[PDB]
Amino acid sequence: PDIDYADISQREQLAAALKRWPLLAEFAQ
Amino acid sequence: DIDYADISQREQLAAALKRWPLLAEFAQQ
Amino acid sequence: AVLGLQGVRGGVGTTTITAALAWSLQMLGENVLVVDACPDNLLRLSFNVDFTHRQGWARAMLDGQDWRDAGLRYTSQLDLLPFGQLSIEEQENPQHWQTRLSDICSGLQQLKASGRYQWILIDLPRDASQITHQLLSLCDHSLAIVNVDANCHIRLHQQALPDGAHILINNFRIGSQVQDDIYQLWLQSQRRLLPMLIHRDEAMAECLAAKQPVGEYRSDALAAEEILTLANWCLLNYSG
Amino acid sequence: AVLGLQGVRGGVGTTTITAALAWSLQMLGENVLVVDACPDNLLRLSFNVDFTHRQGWARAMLDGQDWRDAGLRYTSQLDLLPFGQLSIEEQENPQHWQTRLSDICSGLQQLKASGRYQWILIDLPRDASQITHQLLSLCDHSLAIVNVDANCHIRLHQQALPDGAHILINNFRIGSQVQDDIYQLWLQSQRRLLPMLIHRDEAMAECLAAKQPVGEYRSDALAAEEILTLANWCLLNYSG
Amino acid sequence: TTLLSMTQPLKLRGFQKWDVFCNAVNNMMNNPLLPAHGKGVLVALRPVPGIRVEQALTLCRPNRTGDIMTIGGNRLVLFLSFCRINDLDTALNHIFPLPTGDIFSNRMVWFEDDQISAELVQMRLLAPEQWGMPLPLTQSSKPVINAEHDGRHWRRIPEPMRLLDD
Amino acid sequence: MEDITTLLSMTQPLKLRGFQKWDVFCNAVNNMMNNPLLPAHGKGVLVALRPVPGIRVEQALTLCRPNRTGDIMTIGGNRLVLFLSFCRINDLDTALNHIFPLPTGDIFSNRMVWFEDDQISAELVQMRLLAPEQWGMPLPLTQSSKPVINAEHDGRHWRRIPEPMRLL
Ligand SMILES: Nc1nc2c(ncn2[C@@H]2O[C@@H]3COP(=O)(O)O[C@H]4[C@@H](O)[C@H](n5cnc6c(=O)[nH]c(N)nc65)O[C@@H]4COP(=O)(O)O[C@H]3[C@H]2O)c(=O)[nH]1
Ligand SMILES: Nc1nc2c(ncn2[C@@H]2O[C@@H]3COP(=O)(O)O[C@H]4[C@@H](O)[C@H](n5cnc6c(=O)[nH]c(N)nc65)O[C@@H]4COP(=O)(O)O[C@H]3[C@H]2O)c(=O)[nH]1
Ligand SMILES: Nc1nc2c(ncn2[C@@H]2O[C@@H]3COP(=O)(O)O[C@H]4[C@@H](O)[C@H](n5cnc6c(=O)[nH]c(N)nc65)O[C@@H]4COP(=O)(O)O[C@H]3[C@H]2O)c(=O)[nH]1
Ligand SMILES: Nc1nc2c(ncn2[C@@H]2O[C@@H]3COP(=O)(O)O[C@H]4[C@@H](O)[C@H](n5cnc6c(=O)[nH]c(N)nc65)O[C@@H]4COP(=O)(O)O[C@H]3[C@H]2O)c(=O)[nH]1
Ligand SMILES: Nc1ncnc2c1ncn2[C@@H]1O[C@H](COP(=O)(O)OP(=O)(O)OP(=O)(O)O)[C@@H](O)[C@H]1O
Ligand SMILES: Nc1ncnc2c1ncn2[C@@H]1O[C@H](COP(=O)(O)OP(=O)(O)OP(=O)(O)O)[C@@H](O)[C@H]1O
Ligand SMILES: [Mg+2]
Ligand SMILES: [Mg+2]
């Protein structure tokens, strides 16, 4: 499956979600 | 182990068996 | 075209969606054959097929009979081919029968070439059977069924999906913060995700209890209208 | 004792319950070992194991290494043994490795006989592979995990449960009429139904995204207290 | 429905038969107590070759009372009540669940009274044989060779058949 | 200064709920016994419960979930002691069934009850003889107070780092 975490950091809501859920942050890097 | 004897005693089961033919066909079996 | 539906996990709605999508396509005026390729033989129960009716294409092949006689006409434009009821021993020992289902590959290719149906939908299992791989290769397009939860999120990063598959969301709930977070992340990271989704709908829980597709059970339910949108999207994008 | 937890269907909550039950038993002052027998290797992620950590008992066996070196200590009374990460090649060809893992069957009896653990919890898949049946044979007791929907109602009539297993309800929702109907029918017909159930709970959906058991993530959550009840019920009924 | 298009056209919604649709829009056009050119927008939509008009009609789901549609001569015709022409794409996006550019290959608009009335004149030249009906209505008007009533609802009975071979 | 849970047991014992330390439990029940504005023998029921051999009082305490304000419990000497405020004796099993999630017969092998004021006070006298070393504490409190050698903080919450260890 093509997954593209190119600019996930820029969206505001995604930043707070990646900082609250270690599982999402783990796959984003 | 499933036992379908004396279902009709409870009021709700009788109506449930009538409304949902999936539940009825396993009880009548 | 031949469209395969396979959940990335069990219990995400693949069978219910397959039945609902076959009902929407035949209601749009398309000739549809729906085929249950999952050994659990559940698809038939969404089309008012009696539970004691053990017939099916795989049941017929294991017994030496002709699988073509296992078809079932539901409407003038929707035909059904159940898997068949396996015994408990067959369920516990798949290696006894998994290799004995070779005919269905050529049989489906024949139904493709006959031109009788505009759509052949297949309810596919998530196992790694060779027969399952062969049926996936016969498919022109495929839908990967997911729920918006951490389980499916992990699976989208660690397991393979069918080549060229599109991701379909089912059971989308109201008022789940973690679901909103996973969904917003998917919108920016998942590239095969379909534009429409299917909310969690009581009509989708009840239609199986009524032994009907959701479009027939409750045509005005939200999930019925979402499936109908998906059927039109299939007409526009999976045409073949 | 050795407790197996197997879903009647995929995605009913088996892994989350296994991790939460292990945490509940460890919190009650019991030495617990929890092992992942599902090849998807998802149990480890409920205990803050890095996704890139590939080690596991089945991985060490396929590499000729010592599976005893794959364990991980979570707390002083809770150890876990992941399955290990398989490659996509091994994922799509389970014929090779599903027979090369019978060593764990004999090795579990070593852990069973050492008396180091009062509880050995096994997260079991519902495939019919020989290694799954062997691990289920090692179990002293079993929990069959269901949801209250029409899918599981059918499976309870057409497929086999582990011998002596008890049925555990998960994801019980509020305000579903068809669920209420199926539930009342089960209360009057399903003999093996446990006296407690687990509701749908946002904590159960969030704890996996926080990579923790629900009892550690949110000890005051309703589902945490229900699983703690299940832990005490195991102490009272499954000690033998 | 016909009396509604006569006296209270703005209370109609959803699919209207081709002649009832035209009469409703005409009654809106000739209402003296309505604004001079803010009555709405008439939209003709030609579907892409891969989809028939009755199929594309299933995607047309208006919500504002007064928005009505019809199909005929391989055209889906919408009247969006009191919608300004600038906000046409906003209203269309609310009504269809997919981008209209993916459903329809072409589109024509009339937002002034004289233009709408002239287009109604052309629409009425269309013979009734070309008038479409919704797919659920026509598919339900078909016979049912396997129906069976359970005491409350009609149920279908799957019939054994042979998938032919050649 | 004076502990808040002790202060309440002194002045407003009917406002407590849940687990109370043994001595605070005994003092709260005694202050109810001597309150002149409460009925003569209708203050409630005191219940001592002995767990079945397959469970410890610390584990059985995790099943004791009262909701009525004024219902309190303590553990000590392999006994779980409850006080059900203003519960009539004939309604004991009703109140108990509301507090535990499983049948109390399956959790406890024996039970003793006191509902008269003189009998409750006499039992409080016997309970106060119990040495403080025999007083129990809830499992979440003692378990979570043990040293964590694999802890790590993420800026908001504590997390455990699973450590590799050989199974032997
Ligand atoms: N975004 C958007 N959605 C639109 C618009 N027009 C209609 N809708 C949708 O269609 C529903 C029914 O519209 P209606 O017949 O005008 O019926 C409306 C209308 O009669 C009145 N109403 C609601 N909001 C407004 C408003 O902002 N202005 C006016 N003038 N009336 C409103 O209440 C009824 C029910 O309102 P809702 O629950 O909001 O439900 C609305 C809304 O979901 C629009 O211009 N923009
Ligand atoms: N016939 C038709 N026209 C549509 C529809 N959706 C939008 N329009 C047209 O487009 C304008 C802007 O729509 P908007 O962005 O939704 O912006 C709307 C919306 O945010 C709100 N609004 C107005 N009426 C309603 C309503 O009934 N329900 C809701 N929920 N919001 C409304 O006020 C804004 C301005 O409303 P208007 O002055 O009416 O102006 C509307 C209306 O002229 C539709 O479904 N049908
Ligand atoms: N079946 C049953 N459940 C019991 C009993 N005592 C307590 N509970 C449960 O425990 C909750 C908390 O009780 P509370 O602190 O006494 O707090 C109660 C109490 O102060 C008062 N209350 C409620 N119902 C009654 C009643 O029938 N009589 C009196 N005198 N007060 C009541 O309202 C508060 C909130 O009530 P709820 O929402 O019902 O919430 C109650 C109820 O769920 C009882 O004797 N029988
Ligand atoms: N300390 C304590 N005692 C308990 C508890 N549950 C039951 N009891 C005792 O058992 C009696 C009968 O309880 P019931 O069948 O629930 O019958 C109750 C129940 O139906 C209702 N009720 C009273 N208070 C509440 C309340 O706070 N919440 C609710 N939901 N119902 C209440 O009124 C009925 C008569 O109440 P009472 O005269 O108070 O009488 C209660 C009370 O003496 C409990 O959790 N703690
Ligand atoms: N959107 C929905 N809202 C509510 N209930 C739903 C929804 N989709 C499916 N269900 C219900 O969930 C249950 C499981 O769905 P289904 O059998 O379609 O899933 P599956 O992926 O085919 O599962 P399996 O592993 O058995 O093949 C059924 O009882 C169905 O009615
Ligand atoms: N009671 C519940 N309430 C809410 N979410 C839940 C509940 N139980 C499980 N979930 C969530 O549902 C998803 C699937 O649960 P889980 O992984 O435990 O099921 P499973 O049967 O082990 O899955 P699989 O078939 O992949 O092995 C997870 O995201 C989990 O957090
Ligand atoms: Mg299925
Ligand atoms: Mg699992």
Q: How far is C26 from chain D (nearest CA, A)?
A: 24
Q: Which helix (H) or strand (E) holds D188?
A: helix D177-189
Q: What angle is formed at CA C217 by the lines to CA C214 and CA C221, rounded to 5 degrees?
A: 65
Q: Which of E55, E163, E166 to mutate to test the interface with C (most CBs of C within 10 A)?
A: E163
User: Is residue E102 included in any domain, yes or no?
Assistant: yes
Tokens 């995990």 sit at which residue? D145
- Chain D contact set for F99 (CB, 8 A): none
- Chain A contact set for D208 (CB, 8 A): 23
User: Is residue F27 included in any domain, yes or no?
Assistant: yes
* Chain-chain contact of C127 with D128 (C-beta, under 8 angstroms): no
- Chain B contact set for D192 (CB, 8 A): 1
Question: In sequence order, which ranges of chain C are alpha helices (DSSP H)?
Answer: 14-27, 57-62, 88-92, 103-114, 130-137, 150-158, 177-189, 202-209, 214-217, 222-237
Q: What is d(CA D156, CA D159) in angstroms, rounded to the nearest whole number?
A: 6
Counted residue by residue, chain C has a size of: 240
Q: What is d(CA C10, CA D13) in angstroms, rounded to the nearest whole number?
A: 11
Q: Give the CA radius of gyration of chain D.
A: 17
* Chain-chain contact of B22 with C211 (C-beta, under 8 angstroms): yes
Q: What is d(CA C137, CA F76) in angstroms, rounded to the nearest whole number?
A: 68
Question: Ligand 3 site: residues with CB under 6 angstroms?
Answer: F 67-69, 98
Query: The domain that contains E52 carries what CATH number?
Result: 3.30.70
Q: What angle is formed at CA D11 by the lines to CA C195 and CA C220, rounded to 5 degrees?
A: 45
Whether A17 has its CB under 8 Å from any CB of chain C: the answer is yes
The shares of helix, strand and coil residues in chain B, as percent rounded to the nearest 5, are 55, 5, 40
Phi first, then psi: what are they for F12, rounded to 5°? Answer: -135, 70
Phi first, then psi: what are they for A9, rounded to 5°? Answer: -65, -25
Whether the CB-CB separation of C141 and C233 falls below 8 Å is answered with no
Query: Residue E87 CA: which ligand is closest?
Result: 2
In chain D, the largest separation of any two C-alpha atoms, in whole Å, equals 53
DSSP state of C79: E
Going from the Cα of E106 to the center of ligand 2, the distance in angstroms, rounded, reads 24
Q: How far is D73 from chain C (nearest CA, A)?
A: 23
Q: What is d(CA D124, CA D133) in angstroms, rounded to the nearest whole number?
A: 9
Whether F164 has its CB under 8 Å from any CB of chain D: the answer is yes
Whether E160 has its CB under 8 Å from any CB of chain C: the answer is yes
* Chain-chain contact of C209 with B22 (C-beta, under 8 angstroms): yes
Going from the Cα of E112 to the center of ligand 2, the distance in angstroms, rounded, reads 20
User: Is residue E99 included in any domain, yes or no?
Assistant: yes
Nearest to D9 by CA among C183, E137, F94, C208: C208
Question: In sequence order, which ranges of chain F are alpha helices (DSSP H)?
Answer: 4-11, 22-33, 57-61, 92-99, 104-107, 117-128, 139-144
Phi first, then psi: what are they for D152, rounded to 5°? Answer: -65, -35
- Chain F contact set for D49 (CB, 8 A): 162
The alpha carbon dihedral of D27, D30, D33, D34 has a sign of negative
User: Is residue E112 included in any domain, yes or no?
Assistant: yes
Nearest to F84 by CA among F73, F71, F74, F93: F71
Q: Which helix (H) or strand (E) holds D217?
A: helix D214-217
Q: Which chains touch D (3 or more CB pairs under 8 A)?
A: A, B, C, F
Resolution attained, angstroms: 2.5
Task: Enter the tokens of residue E48.
Answer: 């892409």
Q: Which helix (H) or strand (E) holds A20?
A: helix A12-20
Q: What is d(CA D110, CA D105) in angstroms, rounded to the nearest whole number?
A: 9
Tokens 């990646």 sit at which residue? A18
Q: Which helix (H) or strand (E) holds F48?
A: strand F44-51
Q: Which chains touch E (3 or more CB pairs under 8 A)?
A: C
User: Is residue F45 included in any domain, yes or no?
Assistant: yes
- Chain A contact set for C156 (CB, 8 A): 1, 3
Q: What is d(CA F18, CA E148) in angstroms, rounded to the nearest whole number?
A: 60
Query: D144: exposed, middle or buried (C-beta count within 10 Å: 0-12, 13-18, 19+)?
Result: buried
* Chain-chain contact of A3 with C181 (C-beta, under 8 angstroms): no
- Half-sphere exposure (CA, 13 Å, Cβ side) for C70? 26
Inspect the structure and tell me whether chains F and D have 3 or more CB pairs less than 8 Å apart.
yes
Task: Enter the tokens of residue E89.
Answer: 């794409």
Query: Does the Cβ of F144 fall within 6 Å of ligand 4?
Result: no
The alpha carbon dihedral of B23, B26, B27, B28 has a sign of positive
Going from the Cα of F69 to the center of ligand 3, the distance in angstroms, rounded, reads 9
* Chain-chain contact of B21 with C208 (C-beta, under 8 angstroms): no
Q: Which of D149, D172, D200 to mutate to test the interface with C (most CBs of C within 10 A)?
A: D149
Counted residue by residue, chain E has a size of: 166
Report how many domains make up chain F: 1
Structural domain boundaries enclosing E65: 2-132
* Chain-chain contact of B26 with C209 (C-beta, under 8 angstroms): no
Q: Which residues have a Cβ under 8 Å from the Cβ of D53 and sit 6 or more positions away?
A: D44, D82
Which residue owns the Cα nearest ligand 3 atom 17? F68
SS3 F72: strand
User: Is residue F156 included in any domain, yes or no?
Assistant: no
User: Is residue E90 included in any domain, yes or no?
Assistant: yes
DSSP state of C86: P
Whether the CB-CB separation of E19 and E129 falls below 8 Å is answered with no
SS3 C136: helix
Please report the atom of ligand 4 found closest to the CA of residue F70: 1
Phi first, then psi: what are they for C49, rounded to 5°? Answer: -80, 125
Query: Does the Cβ of C15 fall within 6 Å of ligand 5?
Result: yes
Counted residue by residue, chain F has a size of: 168
Task: Enter the tokens of residue F33.
Answer: 């016994």
Q: What is d(CA D120, CA D57) in angstroms, rounded to the nearest whole number?
A: 15
* Chain-chain contact of D150 with B26 (C-beta, under 8 angstroms): no
Q: How many CB atoms lie within 10 A of CB E166?
A: 6
Tokens 């999508």 sit at which residue? C21
Chain B, chain C: beta-carbon pairs less than 8 Å apart: 18
* CATH entry, C2-238, from 3.40.50.300, 3.40.50.1980, 1.20.1440.60, 3.40.630.30: 3.40.50.300
